[PDB]
Write a structure and sequence with these properties.
This is part of a larger assembly, with six copies of chain A (313 residues). The first copy, chain A, is of the alpha+beta class and 313 residues long. Helix content of chain A is 38%, strand content 13%. In chain A, helix 4 packs antiparallel against helix 6. The longest helix of chain A has 17 residues, at 233-249. The structure holds chloride ion (6 copies). Chains A, B, C, D, E, F: Keywords: ATP-binding, Host cytoplasm, Hydrolase, Magnesium, Metal-binding, Nucleotide-binding, RNA-binding.
Chain lengths: 313, 313, 313, 313, 313, 313
């Protein structure tokens, strides 16, 4: 959803400070009659303060809408505070304030950041600069790459010297959970930027082949791997290509890290490479749906090594 | 109920300060044997302090009475505090103190004010002067007119530049809820005193015709509309006329704002206009029960515009 | 869903007898690997008997599918028995058996018939011929028109000498309930075929205007009225036109009873009349979305008569 | 456990009839003081009839023992009845009665047979001869091979023209469930004895590689495949070899069907082939723990065909 | 309520047989539009059979009415069956059938009869003639006097050779319970018609003075005493006088048994004696509200005898 | 129980300070083996501090004893604190400390004092001197008479200018509740020491005759009335006479206020007067069990005045 769904700007001391919405202000908005010319303007609920522009109505769950967010939950307040805290660390000017609020970001990424921040065991609870960094990435106000330290979080299901694999617990979220109970998604972040040894790549490919064989290793071009089940790969390709095509037309940075060729599924490496080559969605998608195998088993009988380990175990 | 049901006066510093009752003091009172000559005097429970005059026994719910108030609930304490806080903002003298306590006001209006005040999202939680203003109106110690900012509250079900429509959630109240589960009542307050455009009146009439077609738009002469179901209009007329007749005999201000003729139901506009003309209850009531239609559809096929909007939607 | 989803044929005594499926047979089917050439053939689960053709997989709710039916519920068995009982009252030959099983009918209509049949208070519990008649209509193996006596059922919310208005309680169904909680639909059946007086039409229009003002009176061309909210009229038009266009191409009877012009909403009367005239979906649909009012208030101030009745009440 | 744990013989009409134990008879037995010379004799509880020999004490769960069976459950009675019904279909003589009772059989296999028999959807509920056949196999009083029709049961998770794959729901059993919650075991039975096509073998290997990649396809020498996780293969080898070595010393039939070489895991095919060759447990076990790969992928990129199917899906 | 609220007549074999209503038939009736000329006619619900005349609408509890009966409960069916069984023991002719159905009787009396009849411990469960007798009295189709054997029932709280005192458990009733939780009423029936000794009258007056001192001993003129709290005596007088005045104008039998003067409260004996003398309600009521004491303590210090018994106890 | 059951003395600054026991110290004591010569000495639990003398074992509820107190409840701690606070307001010397601890007092009186003290509505919550006074009376370290202000508490069921009637809610107590569920006891304290008018005595006798007719008005010789049911009067006489006889032998003050002769039951006035005259228990008790009536109805037909009030009400 857009950042304008969570907060409004306030001109204080020639800079902008951002204030979370009261959820009853959003409720009043969702009932209000607004002229189309004000559909893009902040709404005044009189009783509960300023509310989001009514053009954002369907980002809010009602009886009419299950594809928005649960704005009356306390997680809405926590996410809005998280955003405001990061947006206020930037002294946003009168120029760039409309662009910042119109930015669409992942709510589920932000709820997971809040979950990290409120846990005394987590580093983000103790370093406000690290929390600031992780939020600025999730909001899209930072060219920095999400690593393990700055990850959205989840349940660690495998760790290496090089990688940490997280389970995205999006079914349990409060603000905007995944409704499809068949949803399972994982995420592999890099612990450092020191180069990763062949032995450490092998251990991660071994775990993926054994424990996540029904999953495709892909990536959206940021610095991390996304472990999705193959039934969803086609939609990931569409979402990825569309962003590629969009920000190439709007002139935004289009840096796409294809990541390790020995870890990424081959069709994904093929479809995204052709994407970077500037081809049509059709030419790229074709590469996605065709048998190519094998590219190489970059490491041989990994699955059998794990198998003999289990037999002995 | 009378304000004397919630507090007693204390002469401090040549002014009067008002103290809420302990509910066990009311319990002791309700069991006490009192001479008829003291039935109007404040009662001393010895153990729990001063209690209301025993003449107010049936304002209190017992096994004998379900038409009083739940004085042992915490909402009783909150309402009594709300009243005392407002009555103490006035430095009530030894003259006007009996008149102030004998004032009958709506408990349900006061419980809703408390509900507003305790909510951090509500303006009344943040402006003690606004809370003071809203209470002084509800108590009847202010010639000011209740607007949206000073409203008793409820659930906002429709808002305009000009109007806010509240649902009176009197079934859920703790202190003195409506017992009749068929009860539904709404309330439309004005956001400002700036004049209201024809477009904004039209939007409110449109919502009433579409969403509240089984409801009569009326008013008790204060500055707001009361959306009641027609099965209750007759009783509203009686209650309204009686107040008119009472305070015209007792010499109190009798200002009756008939409000917008295009919004009020026609029989109500007719019955109350004849009321202001000084006619009998019978002549006024007759106007209430007779087909007159139409006065005008002040705005034509409003219902059909809404209908085509829903079809497209 | 298709009748082949509930039962399979058995050649007994040169006629066909129909047998309900065991739900575990459907479960085994949903896990089975089937060649595409057998996708249309009845499946053998070995342990639990014959199962539906695997081409009908998505009529069955799984973790993959919420748009099928709850085939493991006892209502599945009751509906399958209801169908089999009716199909066995016909001595279906080897010719017409494929056509009968491929017939798509409303499951929710059948669950409601079962609800009627199992109630000792209902006439259908006591007349097996009436139950047979009502089922044969719901299955589409009868040219007879559904009346009140043969209705699917529901909660009676208004009755006349001429009409009975039913609430379709599809949210509470067990086998294939409506998932959208905003669903509300009503149905007005005719008690007889004796002509209906103007006074009795007036009473039904009066109740619809007062109690169901947010609803459009329409019909799918069978002998009864369908009371749907206007947000759904567009989809009803599509479904209706498509059936019209389909069975005009497949040569099936296309009898469309437009029903009383004074009861049906005007755009619906217009869109369906143009449908019977053989026009395009676009020309018909245009009539559906255009202000035409008024056609006539066939009975004047009906709403005001009801209103004065409530005021007196 | 031994069949003597469930019933005792009764000499009726020169043949033996078998009677289930009362569970309170077993309770009395478990408290009784018995001389070692009677430890092998049927016990008389006086109040509740005959009880098992006290030598079988640890087949019964007490506070002292969690590795026995829940003999006071109703499933104990149902299993004892199932056994008695089968043992009485044989007119067991005074000679072979001690051997029959001393037979050790799988309780969990018998509880699953009862679960099949009591289900109207199951063929075994309707054919007492089929139930008789399936029980006689589970008891070990039949040289016939367990097929799909005579299987112990469970949840069908995959079916073919040739195979049915069952999930052994041993965690939910009442009489003697598996206590280890990490337990998962599957079972593939043959639907017929007609030879199985290469296409149908391929479909089963495809499902095993995709859906059960962490599982080893093995067999205990009867006519069906056992899908166990590799952490358990070593114990299966021990149990299998021990039975091989035992009944080769006691002279019992030692028929071991190694089953399809293209379906069985290679180390299992190797370890059991060497078993049939008469080698030591050590030589056989060595084959079990050594990398050999590959034997062949008998069907190539099966996993990739399934993968592209999921991507399209 | 009227007997016509529970059943309708059917002309069978030149006599009338009475049939209980289906509760859904009453539901359909309560929603139906009926002309005023048919308001007195039996209603046809088509689906659920015949229903009561719509003029009896407010005998049925709805959301609009809490002063009717819970007709959808199973006690409604049981009471209707009880009535029908008694009305069918009379071969009611075409003449007297309207009078019988219009008879108003106590529902609570009938629910208590059902409670007696369904209890194997009760004599009425075993003698259908006694049940018939008790019902015919409660319905008002018998000149016989209700005694202990034919009583409506309740909890026996005191018994004598002469009297049985019942507690009317009307708060727990299902069909038409008393809503006022302060309700307590008792009933003293005579066990025989043999004359009652002075010792046995004394024991009953002793128990009433000790255990029910806050209660007035009265009677409605049938053969039994009614133990009501004095807060209700005034309403009993009104109800009693009204019946007296009614059936003296309609010419019905007006037999009023004042019962024992030493047991009945004196004002009640005075008010009812003056009633039998033909005086106005005012003259009679005056006697009810005036100190007269004492008439006599017919038995002296009864209360003190009981007191010394308790002290010793 | 004895005060030594709740606390032990500590010699601080040449005065004694009293410390509540830890309940686990009492538990350790109840398990300890103690020589008979130390049965009267404070016990050392080592882990939980000092415990009561083991001679007080049966004041503590165990599985062996239900006639002690629930010493592990938090009310034990609250009562022990209440006692210690009062005992420390006295600077008890080394002489009188054994006598103070051996004092037997009513636990239930003390739990009720705690209930008063912890209630913000109660005067005792606000005046530590009043709480001190009330406790010193309950402990027996004050010659002052318990009045309304210093009462143990309970539920006020009737109040006058002169009297307050309390219900002793001893069934709900936590520390040492009455186990007999038939227990009902009331208590009438005097509000002042100003003389009480005849009108105010009459009102109290009126309420007792009407509302508590099954109760005997008595007194234990302190300044208040005890409303007990007559089934208990005999035991009250015994307990009262025994105290009279005891403290006349031990030389303690024997002041017995017989209280108003017109309020006290006559046998109680007779039995206690003879007690003060120095007669035997037998002569006194005889007066208790003999009919004497009447002494006088000091106020005539009080019961009938109340009765006519209820009839009008
Ligand atoms: Cl990425
Ligand atoms: Cl108003
Ligand atoms: Cl239709
Ligand atoms: Cl096997
Ligand atoms: Cl009577
Ligand atoms: Cl006392």
């Amino acid at each position: 959803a857009e950042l304008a769904c969570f907060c409004y700007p306030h001109l204080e001391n020639d800079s902008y400070k951002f204030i979370p919405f009261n959820n009853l202000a959003i409720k009043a908005m969702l009932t209000a009659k607004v002229d189309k010319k004000d559909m893009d303007k902040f709404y005044d609920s009189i009783i509960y303060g300023i509310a989001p522009p009514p053009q954002f109505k369907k980002r809010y769950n009602t009886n009419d809408n299950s594809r928005g967010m649960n704005f009356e939950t306390i997680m809405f307040t926590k996410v809005a505070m998280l955003i405001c805290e990061a947006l206020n660390s930037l002294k946003v000017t009168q120029a760039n304030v409309s662009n910042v609020l119109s930015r669409v970001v992942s709510i589920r990424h932000l709820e997971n950041l809040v979950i990290r921040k409120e846990n005394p065991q987590d580093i983000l609870f103790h370093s406000k600069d690290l929390l600031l960094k992780s939020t600025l990435i999730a909001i899209g106000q930072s060219k920095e790459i999400e690593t393990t330290i700055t990850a959205e979080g989840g349940e660690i299901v495998f760790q290496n010297a090089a990688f940490t694999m997280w389970k995205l617990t999006y079914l349990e979220h409060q603000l905007m959970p995944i409704l499809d109970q068949n949803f399972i998604e994982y995420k592999v972040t890099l612990n450092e930027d020191k180069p990763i040894s062949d032995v450490h790549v092998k251990e991660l490919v071994a775990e993926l082949r054994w424990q996540y064989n029904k999953f495709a290793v892909i990536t959206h071009g940021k610095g991390h791997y996304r472990i999705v089940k193959y039934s969803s790969v086609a939609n990931h390709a569409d979402r990825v290509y569309a962003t590629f095509k969009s920000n190439v037309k709007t002139g935004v940075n289009n840096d796409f890290n294809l990541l390790d060729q020995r870890i990424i599924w081959q069709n994904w490496y093929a479809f995204t490479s052709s994407m970077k080559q500037g081809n049509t969605l059709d030419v790229c998608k074709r590469l996605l749906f065709q048998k190519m195998k094998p590219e190489k088993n970059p490491f041989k009988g990994l699955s059998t090594d794990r198998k003999m380990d289990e037999v002995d175990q």
